[PDB]
Amino acid sequence: LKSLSLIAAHSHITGLGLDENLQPRPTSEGMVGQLQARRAAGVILKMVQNGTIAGRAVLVAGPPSTGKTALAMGVSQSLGKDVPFTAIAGSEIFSLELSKTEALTQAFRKSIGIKIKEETELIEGEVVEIQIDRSITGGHKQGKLTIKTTDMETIYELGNKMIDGLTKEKVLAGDVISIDKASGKITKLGRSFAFVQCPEGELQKRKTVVHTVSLHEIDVINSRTQGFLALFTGDTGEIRSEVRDQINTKVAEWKEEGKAEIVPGVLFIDEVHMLDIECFSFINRALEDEFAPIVMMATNRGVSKTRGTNYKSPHGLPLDLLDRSIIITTKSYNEQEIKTILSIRAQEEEVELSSDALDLLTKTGVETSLRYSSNLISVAQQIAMKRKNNTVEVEDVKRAYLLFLDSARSVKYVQENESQYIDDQGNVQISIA
Amino acid sequence: LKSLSLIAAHSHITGLGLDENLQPRPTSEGMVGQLQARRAAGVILKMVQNGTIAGRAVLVAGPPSTGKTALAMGVSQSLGKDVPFTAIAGSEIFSLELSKTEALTQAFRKSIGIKIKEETELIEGEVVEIQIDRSITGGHKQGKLTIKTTDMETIYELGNKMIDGLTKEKVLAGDVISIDKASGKITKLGRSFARSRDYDAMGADTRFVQCPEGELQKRKTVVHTVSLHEIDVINSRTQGFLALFTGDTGEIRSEVRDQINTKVAEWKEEGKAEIVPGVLFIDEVHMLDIECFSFINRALEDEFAPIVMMATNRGVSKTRGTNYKSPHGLPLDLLDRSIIITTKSYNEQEIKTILSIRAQEEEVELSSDALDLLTKTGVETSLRYSSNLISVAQQIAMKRKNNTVEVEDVKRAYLLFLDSARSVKYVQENESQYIDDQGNVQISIAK
Amino acid sequence: TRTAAHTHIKGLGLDESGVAKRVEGGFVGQIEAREACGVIVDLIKAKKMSGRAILLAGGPSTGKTALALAISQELGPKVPFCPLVGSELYSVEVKKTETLMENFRRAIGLRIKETKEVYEGEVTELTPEDAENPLGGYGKTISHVIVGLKSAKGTKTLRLDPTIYESIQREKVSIGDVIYIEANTGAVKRVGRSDAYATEFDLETEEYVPLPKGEVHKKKEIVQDVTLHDLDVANARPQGGQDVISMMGQLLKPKKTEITEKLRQEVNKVVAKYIDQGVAELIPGVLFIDEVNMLDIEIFTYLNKALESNIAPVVVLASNRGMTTVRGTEDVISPHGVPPDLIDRLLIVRTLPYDKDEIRTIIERRATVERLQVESSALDLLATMGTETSLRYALQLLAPCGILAQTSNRKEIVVNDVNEAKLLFLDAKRSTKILETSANYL
Amino acid sequence: VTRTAAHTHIKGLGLDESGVAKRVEGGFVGQIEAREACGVIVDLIKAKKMSGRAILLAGGPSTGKTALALAISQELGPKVPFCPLVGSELYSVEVKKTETLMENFRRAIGLRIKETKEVYEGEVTELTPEDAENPLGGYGKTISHVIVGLKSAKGTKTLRLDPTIYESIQREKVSIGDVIYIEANTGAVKRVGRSDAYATEFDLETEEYVPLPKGEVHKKKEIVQDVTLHDLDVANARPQGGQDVISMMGQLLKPKKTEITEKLRQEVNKVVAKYIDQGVAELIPGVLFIDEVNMLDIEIFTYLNKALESNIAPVVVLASNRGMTTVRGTEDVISPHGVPPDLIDRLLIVRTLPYDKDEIRTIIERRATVERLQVESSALDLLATMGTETSLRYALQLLAPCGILAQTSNRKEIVVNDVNEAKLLFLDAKRSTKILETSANYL
Amino acid sequence: VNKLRCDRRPIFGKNLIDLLTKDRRVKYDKSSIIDNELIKPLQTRVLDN
Ligand SMILES: Nc1ncnc2c1ncn2[C@@H]1O[C@H](COP(=O)(O)OP(=O)(O)O)[C@@H](O)[C@H]1O
Ligand SMILES: Nc1ncnc2c1ncn2[C@@H]1O[C@H](COP(=O)(O)OP(=O)(O)O)[C@@H](O)[C@H]1O
Ligand SMILES: Nc1ncnc2c1ncn2[C@@H]1O[C@H](COP(=O)(O)OP(=O)(O)O)[C@@H](O)[C@H]1O
Ligand SMILES: Nc1ncnc2c1ncn2[C@@H]1O[C@H](COP(=O)(O)OP(=O)(O)O)[C@@H](O)[C@H]1O
Ligand SMILES: [Mg+2]
Ligand SMILES: [Mg+2]
Numbered sequence A: 001l002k003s004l005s006l007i008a009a010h011s012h013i014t015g016l017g018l019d020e021n022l023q024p025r026p027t028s029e030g031m032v033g034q035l036q037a038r039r040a041a042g043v044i045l046k047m048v049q050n051g052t053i054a055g056r057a058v059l060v061a062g063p064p065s066t067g068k069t070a071l072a073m074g075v076s077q078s079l080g081k082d083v084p085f086t087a088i089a090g091s092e093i094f095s096l097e098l099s100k101t102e103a104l105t106q107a108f109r110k111s112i113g114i115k116i117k118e119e120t121e122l123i124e125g126e127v128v129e130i131q132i133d134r135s136i137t138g139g140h141k142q143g144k145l146t147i148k149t150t151d152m153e154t155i156y157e158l159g160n161k162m163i164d165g166l167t168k169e170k171v172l173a174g175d176v177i178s179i180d181k182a183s184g185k186i187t188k189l190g191r192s193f194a195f196v197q198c199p200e201g202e203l204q205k206r207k208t209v210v211h212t213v214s215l216h217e218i219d220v221i222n223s224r225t226q227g228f229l230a231l232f233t234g235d236t237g238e239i240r241s242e243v244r245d246q247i248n249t250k251v252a253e254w255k256e257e258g259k260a261e262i263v264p265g266v267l268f269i270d271e272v273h274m275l276d277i278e279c280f281s282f283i284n285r286a287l288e289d290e291f292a293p294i295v296m297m298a299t300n301r302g303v304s305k306t307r308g309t310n311y312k313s314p315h316g317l318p319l320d321l322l323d324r325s326i327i328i329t330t331k332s333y334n335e336q337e338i339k340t341i342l343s344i345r346a347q348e349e350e351v352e353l354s355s356d357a358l359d360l361l362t363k364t365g366v367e368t369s370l371r372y373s374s375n376l377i378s379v380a381q382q383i384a385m386k387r388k389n390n391t392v393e394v395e396d397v398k399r400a401y402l403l404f405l406d407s408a409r410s411v412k413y414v415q416e417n418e419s420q421y422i423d424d425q426g427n428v429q430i431s432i433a
Numbered sequence B: 001l002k003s004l005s006l007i008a009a010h011s012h013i014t015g016l017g018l019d020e021n022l023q024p025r026p027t028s029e030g031m032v033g034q035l036q037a038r039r040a041a042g043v044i045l046k047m048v049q050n051g052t053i054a055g056r057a058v059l060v061a062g063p064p065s066t067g068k069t070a071l072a073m074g075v076s077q078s079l080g081k082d083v084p085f086t087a088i089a090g091s092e093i094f095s096l097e098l099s100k101t102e103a104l105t106q107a108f109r110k111s112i113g114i115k116i117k118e119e120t121e122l123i124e125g126e127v128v129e130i131q132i133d134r135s136i137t138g139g140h141k142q143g144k145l146t147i148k149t150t151d152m153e154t155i156y157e158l159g160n161k162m163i164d165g166l167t168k169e170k171v172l173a174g175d176v177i178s179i180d181k182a183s184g185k186i187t188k189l190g191r192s193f194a195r196s197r198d199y200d201a202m203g204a205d206t207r208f209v210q211c212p213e214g215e216l217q218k219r220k221t222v223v224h225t226v227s228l229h230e231i232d233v234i235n236s237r238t239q240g241f242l243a244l245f246t247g248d249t250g251e252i253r254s255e256v257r258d259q260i261n262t263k264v265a266e267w268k269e270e271g272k273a274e275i276v277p278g279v280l281f282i283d284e285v286h287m288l289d290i291e292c293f294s295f296i297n298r299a300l301e302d303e304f305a306p307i308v309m310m311a312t313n314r315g316v317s318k319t320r321g322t323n324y325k326s327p328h329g330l331p332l333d334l335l336d337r338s339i340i341i342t343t344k345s346y347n348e349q350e351i352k353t354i355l356s357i358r359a360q361e362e363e364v365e366l367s368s369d370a371l372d373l374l375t376k377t378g379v380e381t382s383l384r385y386s387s388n389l390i391s392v393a394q395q396i397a398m399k400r401k402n403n404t405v406e407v408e409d410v411k412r413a414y415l416l417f418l419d420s421a422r423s424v425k426y427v428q429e430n431e432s433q434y435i436d437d438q439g440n441v442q443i444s445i446a447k
Numbered sequence C: 001t002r003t004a005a006h007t008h009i010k011g012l013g014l015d016e017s018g019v020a021k022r023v024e025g026g027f028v029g030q031i032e033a034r035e036a037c038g039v040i041v042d043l044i045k046a047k048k049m050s051g052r053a054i055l056l057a058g059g060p061s062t063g064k065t066a067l068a069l070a071i072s073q074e075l076g077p078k079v080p081f082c083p084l085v086g087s088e089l090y091s092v093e094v095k096k097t098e099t100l101m102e103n104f105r106r107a108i109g110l111r112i113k114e115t116k117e118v119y120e121g122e123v124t125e126l127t128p129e130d131a132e133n134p135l136g137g138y139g140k141t142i143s144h145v146i147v148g149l150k151s152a153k154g155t156k157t158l159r160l161d162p163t164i165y166e167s168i169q170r171e172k173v174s175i176g177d178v179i180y181i182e183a184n185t186g187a188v189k190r191v192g193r194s195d196a197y198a199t200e201f202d203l204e205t206e207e208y209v210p211l212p213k214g215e216v217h218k219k220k221e222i223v224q225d226v227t228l229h230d231l232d233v234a235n236a237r238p239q240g241g242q243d244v245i246s247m248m249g250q251l252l253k254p255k256k257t258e259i260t261e262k263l264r265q266e267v268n269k270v271v272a273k274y275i276d277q278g279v280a281e282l283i284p285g286v287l288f289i290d291e292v293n294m295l296d297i298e299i300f301t302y303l304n305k306a307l308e309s310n311i312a313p314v315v316v317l318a319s320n321r322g323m324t325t326v327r328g329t330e331d332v333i334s335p336h337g338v339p340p341d342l343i344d345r346l347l348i349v350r351t352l353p354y355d356k357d358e359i360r361t362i363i364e365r366r367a368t369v370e371r372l373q374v375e376s377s378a379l380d381l382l383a384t385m386g387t388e389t390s391l392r393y394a395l396q397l398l399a400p401c402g403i404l405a406q407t408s409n410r411k412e413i414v415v416n417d418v419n420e421a422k423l424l425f426l427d428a429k430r431s432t433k434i435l436e437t438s439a440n441y442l
Numbered sequence D: 001v002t003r004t005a006a007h008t009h010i011k012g013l014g015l016d017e018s019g020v021a022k023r024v025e026g027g028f029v030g031q032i033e034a035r036e037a038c039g040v041i042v043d044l045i046k047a048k049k050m051s052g053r054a055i056l057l058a059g060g061p062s063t064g065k066t067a068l069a070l071a072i073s074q075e076l077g078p079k080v081p082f083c084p085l086v087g088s089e090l091y092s093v094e095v096k097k098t099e100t101l102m103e104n105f106r107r108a109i110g111l112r113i114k115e116t117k118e119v120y121e122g123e124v125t126e127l128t129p130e131d132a133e134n135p136l137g138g139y140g141k142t143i144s145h146v147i148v149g150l151k152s153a154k155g156t157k158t159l160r161l162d163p164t165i166y167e168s169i170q171r172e173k174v175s176i177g178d179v180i181y182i183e184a185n186t187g188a189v190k191r192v193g194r195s196d197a198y199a200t201e202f203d204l205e206t207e208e209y210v211p212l213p214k215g216e217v218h219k220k221k222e223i224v225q226d227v228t229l230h231d232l233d234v235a236n237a238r239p240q241g242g243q244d245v246i247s248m249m250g251q252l253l254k255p256k257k258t259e260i261t262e263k264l265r266q267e268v269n270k271v272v273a274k275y276i277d278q279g280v281a282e283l284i285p286g287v288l289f290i291d292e293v294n295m296l297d298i299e300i301f302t303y304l305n306k307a308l309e310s311n312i313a314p315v316v317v318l319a320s321n322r323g324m325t326t327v328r329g330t331e332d333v334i335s336p337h338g339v340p341p342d343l344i345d346r347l348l349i350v351r352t353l354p355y356d357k358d359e360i361r362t363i364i365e366r367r368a369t370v371e372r373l374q375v376e377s378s379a380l381d382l383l384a385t386m387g388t389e390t391s392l393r394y395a396l397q398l399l400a401p402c403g404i405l406a407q408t409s410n411r412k413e414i415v416v417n418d419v420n421e422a423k424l425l426f427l428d429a430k431r432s433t434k435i436l437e438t439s440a441n442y443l
Numbered sequence E: 001v002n003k004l005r006c007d008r009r010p011i012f013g014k015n016l017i018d019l020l021t022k023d024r025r026v027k028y029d030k031s032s033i034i035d036n037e038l039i040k041p042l043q044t045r046v047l048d049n
């Protein structure tokens, strides 16, 4: 149900918070402000849910500490389960073992899922009697068992494999057991009287099971006989393109036959501002294939130099992708918006804040970065814990502020004491005298 | 004498010339001069022998051909055996298979040694005859065998598991075997001499041994000297013992390292194993990456950190991996947590004494005027340039078959082989003939 | 009894919920720094946050690593703590991102507690109990098996279900041999013959174990801990005796591979399932990185991405540089070599240089630790030297003075010994001056 | 018939018993000082006393540096190991350069091994297992011994073998009538084949036939095979024994170079020293030669200083041609011959002088005589003039096509018209550069 | 035979066969835990998939 969860940066964000008209609410689902950006994200989410288009690349922009990564996390949350979502960093593809093109291809393939469903009969009932006829140093053995439900009760004669199945795991009369006839798996639902009610209705019922596996797993499996281990150890290298083409044809014909359905997902790349020209050139052609997931790209850099080239390009990317990409911009944050963000962060961490404390935290997060206050809140609560009161006061926040330095203050102190610190040229002064 | 006796650059030096008061004699143990440096080396040696201190870095400084490598070799010789002493070069750590940090970690782990003692209870003795009642009762009828030594012999009763184990590795009596008291392991030592004449061609495993003497069973203790790095290598791999010889350790993870540290601490607390601090010496450390320097700075503050000594003949120059020039060729942070020992260039008297000791080392006798001329040449040239001239002059004298080396032979040797300055002058005078930096060169003499 | 620039730090030197004392736990001065460190210790002990990063910056020899050692000591051995260097991440075998992620996972720990009921003792006898079969038949039917257990200061006999016959036949244990039986799981495990039967044979390949002490029925609770990275590597690495992959691990070289995210998420899911039953208890750790100025810009970007994960533990960074350029970018200049975006994500803790009196106190405390005694005049001279050249030079010079005093058969160091040390051993400044004043390439 | 490649006309340094080099000897002319120095180095090598001594010889291109480095090896003799090397070959993909340099260093020094072995060989007349009737309690069923008779030309003999050798020969699948080979030391048994006496037994037969061996049955002999220490280290690191499936898989895998630890070399040194003390072996120092040392990196140059101070370091010689140049891997360090100053301090410098016009003419004459070609005096003088005009190697290379040109006209002598035609058909570096200066598209 | 026997004797294990197992020997007992169900090695994953 719930995986390993701890209070992180984007724990509070759960969904975009949009209406039926795709008009964002001022404060909903942990999202505050950024009305146009949220509306664009909702449009993209609706496009992904439609699933009738492919190869669409969207780049989000804005200064640091603006919420682009938060917007992507909200998009993932609103996307729900059953739809693949891959979030990777820019530097993740620089693999020493796998080619960068191969890593990008694997990332693209991982975003597309495939659903296959099948019907498996199930037999579940309460054990009445178990009888196993064996022979010491005799070889062949026999067995008989009686199963029971609320409505019906019969004796079943077991095969040779069933004897091993019921003997590998201890099975008694007081156990409630469901077994798949085709699969042969034996499951112990619970323990009856030696506290679970006996199964009702028919003893044997047929139920449908669906297996969801991303396409990249199919490529890895069919790449080599020993490639299945690479699905866990990650040790696969340079899968032949013919394998990918055959897999694409098989997937297309499966979708045509209706045996399986494909679920396009979203590939998210964080800090795309750093990458190589080879990666961009490969993406230019990879986005044009039929099985291209919708790609979201984030970049906080300005007009800088693309890695692998001497010249400086706008937005940190060459114009080739910018021609074929869609740009969503983000704006700064108002003081009231910062106050609401801090309040929602406190509510997420169940920390009680004084009104004056909240106002001064908002003012210092307006002067400094928002992340500074969003981090200082927990330390202020920890300090207030030492005073044996469950409420953060102005004095606690002031003590935390003077205890922990901001970037600008630290820069000023370093500049005032440049002799003490290590110079870029390597010179440093350590003697006090 | 156990090592190969080929004469190397540092062969005359043996130990240190210090006394019980740590006063260096002017000429002792094959070393001349450098009284302050020798006293510092003796202090460091006593520091290492104390063993209660660890994680200290000492620097050795001096111009080329001053005695830094000789001082390190003398320190190692004075330390003697049974104490690890790893001597590596700076450029050695650059490995394609292993990361530089892992190479430094392995070098540090090699320099620290460990002694482990083990006790065994063994019963070794020639067997007289084995009888088993396979027909009277059948199926481990509690057979009996007699074991004989040169001083004593008894009869033992054998159980079912004894018979089952003895069926494997069949014994036909008249053989010397050892049985384990704890696990009951059957080990065949060797046959007796009475079986030597049975055939004319023996098997590969066939061997003959004498009858063991003394008590039938003995309690003995064995002490092994294995350094840590071997322990980590063995623990890391299913068969790690081969990785020592092959050298493909495979970047051992730190988890195994901390497990080994905990095991060693537990053994030390139990008293089974004792720790023997060693010395790690890095030569020509002037060349190294800055990452290695930072890793050394961090790793010098660990409990299992052997004393590290480094040498460098470079002045204020550029450090590898950085554009800027640092003093002494090393970053200042490392220089902070270090002690620097400086060595001064030798004097003419010191040079001639060293030349005399080198000539005596090579079983070469020299004329007085020949020695004076060699010292005069080595004053203007370097000291290291004189030893090769000495060897060549001895070869020339042997060619002339006239006892000691004469001044004429030394002059001829100097004429035949040029010094660096003379070669530079000759190259500059004929710069057209040699290949220039731009690749341009002139071949034809005629213009 | 070995010390290396440390081991004289015992905790943070704080008090019971207040400002740290002037001298405590081998700490002198820098009250604000260790107060903040104690606040951080309380925060991690809360075990609620995730991905909280702090950074301390200051001049060389200002106790930057000492504070990290102190917080590591204060946390306790049970809490995981992984020291690391900036140069650690550059690995030939696998990309740097994988190594950083592996270290992150190794920082997080996990504790497992289990209770077991044990019935152990010497096997007095084994007697089946006969009863009438529910279904008519001429064959023998057994309803219970009677086993007697004998131990020191207590013996008992147990009546068990007859299904224990398979286990007792498998263990090949007959009579007068110590066995172990679990209450609910059943089954039996032979541990060795009773020591009283050792003399029954002249020779024996089988060890004899003494009878268990105390009652035959025991209730012991066992606690085991392991980090998440160990679970991941055990899941990924194959094990076995004769399956083909088993010696395919042999005749080859096992090397680090980029572990997939699906394996990590499966491990997380099973860990969550087990912890929902109360058997498990997750404890976050602390990751310590030194010389963070040496990290590549790509590693900085991946750190920025990873710090927002829901499982990322608390990391602590140290740097002794100021206005420098981040490695991998010739134009970007940021304080301490950390890119500005990463600095925006953490908290900066300042560190201040010490004074002459603090230096003297440090020297005297170190001398007490090193088990050697100095005079007041010698101590003052050493403090003046440390204030002149550097603190670390004075700290390193201690052992040579002890050795020199030992050579002179003296127990305490005098001014003459420290003078001999100063003339024999040089510091950085004199060496630099010699290099400047010499033209012999030295 | 006989092939010549810029060499093979040098049979040695050509020095008298007093060390004075003759004007013309062993395909060499001039360079008396260099030849005397090389002879001194040869004597030092044969002294087998010094270790790690290094010399370096420097000069312009085509000054005889490679010729001297080959003549010294020729004078040394095939017994003493001599491993030529080029500075570029050190950089290896599989292992670091330092490991390759150390491996070559250990390859340089050699060692000879003497051991005595006795062999029973001959045609198998009969074999007979002997089973003892006493169970003795210790075994169920085994053969006490096996009696095998061996026949050869000088006579016949019978043998008595323990069950291990019998099992080995049974595994060898040998019946009566097959020539076998028994080694007394290790008990090795190998089937040479069936004796030729049974060739006519069947009309056709897959098995080959071997003549009956000489010697009575049993022979005593010793082997004086000489093996360098690097082979010992490789064998220790890469064992060949074992019948395990894992061992076969390892044998199938390609042999990758690995950093042999210093501990293994120390153990090899210990056992070698023990054997040489016992007198069963003798150690012979070798010579390592590296050409174009300017191609080496600064790291290899630094490690050479540590390597040359080792105990078992052999004599190494170096060749270079550049003058004031920058060491590779550095930025501004300019040193003579592209060698760092410390290494130059550690070694000795030998200078090679250029050649006079008369010396060039004599070289051309000697080379032409080696190639078994007839050259007219006027044509030879013209060749000497044009070689002095451009280069000696140009004339040496042009000596070859002139023979084909003469053969085409069926004449057996080199004529001025032939060499002129060759010069027309083949251009030297200077003409190529001059025509390259004025051309449209890179010429 | 004397020479062969004398030469076949000085065959020394470089370190040991008992040192190896003595350093493998972990004093920590079996301490069976749920780690058997927590590890799920590669072969089990192949089998159940
Ligand atoms: N609308 C919002 N709702 C909640 N949190 C926000 C919002 N906008 C920004 N943030 C916070 O600002 C921080 C920085 O935003 P993010 O896009 O994740 O990284 P950056 O903008 O610094 O690249 C995040 O931790 C996020 O919690
Ligand atoms: N005290 C000494 N007595 C005799 N010879 C010495 C002494 N010190 C140095 N040498 C000589 O100096 C040489 C080593 O010089 P070294 O210190 O290696 O130069 P560098 O400083 O460039 O490393 C050796 O050949 C040795 O003979
Ligand atoms: N309060 C203190 N008490 C005692 N020793 C201290 C104290 N603060 C720092 N030190 C000394 O400073 C050293 C730590 O140096 P550090 O500042 O970590 O180096 P860097 O600046 O390179 O990280 C330790 O060896 C310790 O002995
Ligand atoms: N003194 C000489 N006598 C005969 N041939 C010589 C002499 N010097 C050089 N040569 C010839 O020059 C050719 C190439 O010279 P080489 O030594 O390779 O040039 P470098 O010195 O540039 O390596 C060799 O084939 C050799 O036969
Ligand atoms: Mg962001
Ligand atoms: Mg040296």
Ligand SMILES: [Mg+2]
Binding pocket: C064, C065, C066, C290
């Ligand atoms: Mg530090």
Ligand SMILES: [Mg+2]
Binding pocket: D061, D062, D066
């Ligand atoms: Mg040449």
